[PDB]
Design a protein around this motif. Structure first.
Motif, PDB file in Angstrom:
ATOM      1  N   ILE A 117       0.792  -1.221   0.000  1.00  0.00           N
ATOM      2  CA  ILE A 117       0.000   0.000   0.000  1.00  0.00           C
ATOM      3  C   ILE A 117       0.836   1.289   0.000  1.00  0.00           C
ATOM      4  O   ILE A 117       0.264   2.384   0.002  1.00  0.00           O
ATOM      5  CB  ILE A 117      -1.009   0.054   1.180  1.00  0.00           C
ATOM      6  N   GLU A 118       2.161   1.169   0.055  1.00  0.00           N
ATOM      7  CA  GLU A 118       3.035   2.348   0.106  1.00  0.00           C
ATOM      8  C   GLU A 118       3.073   3.036  -1.248  1.00  0.00           C
ATOM      9  O   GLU A 118       2.892   2.399  -2.282  1.00  0.00           O
ATOM     10  CB  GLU A 118       4.472   1.951   0.471  1.00  0.00           C
ATOM     11  N   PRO A 119       3.392   4.340  -1.263  1.00  0.00           N
ATOM     12  CA  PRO A 119       3.418   5.076  -2.536  1.00  0.00           C
ATOM     13  C   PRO A 119       4.675   4.881  -3.365  1.00  0.00           C
ATOM     14  O   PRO A 119       4.700   5.309  -4.516  1.00  0.00           O
ATOM     15  CB  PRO A 119       3.251   6.541  -2.101  1.00  0.00           C
ATOM     16  N   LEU A 120       5.727   4.297  -2.804  1.00  0.00           N
ATOM     17  CA  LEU A 120       6.997   4.032  -3.520  1.00  0.00           C
ATOM     18  C   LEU A 120       7.540   2.697  -3.010  1.00  0.00           C
ATOM     19  O   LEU A 120       7.272   2.302  -1.859  1.00  0.00           O
ATOM     20  CB  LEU A 120       8.027   5.127  -3.346  1.00  0.00           C
ATOM     21  N   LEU A 135       6.976  -1.636   1.129  1.00  0.00           N
ATOM     22  CA  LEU A 135       8.041  -0.876   1.745  1.00  0.00           C
ATOM     23  C   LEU A 135       9.413  -1.425   1.301  1.00  0.00           C
ATOM     24  O   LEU A 135      10.343  -0.665   1.049  1.00  0.00           O
ATOM     25  CB  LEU A 135       7.917  -0.916   3.276  1.00  0.00           C
ATOM     26  N   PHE A 136       9.545  -2.756   1.254  1.00  0.00           N
ATOM     27  CA  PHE A 136      10.784  -3.379   0.838  1.00  0.00           C
ATOM     28  C   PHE A 136      10.466  -4.765   0.305  1.00  0.00           C
ATOM     29  O   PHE A 136       9.420  -5.351   0.596  1.00  0.00           O
ATOM     30  CB  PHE A 136      11.814  -3.464   1.997  1.00  0.00           C
TER      31      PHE A 136
END
Length: 21
Positions: A2-5, A17-18
């Motif tokens: 769900i992260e933007p990058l 995230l990673f």
């Protein structure tokens, strides 16, 4: 993911995230 990058997350349509391996 769900992260933007980050590595793309097919399952939630945004980014992890990673990621590894």
């Amino acid at each position: 993911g769900i992260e933007p990058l980050g590595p793309v997350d097919e399952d939630q349509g945004e980014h992890y995230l990673f990621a590894g391996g």
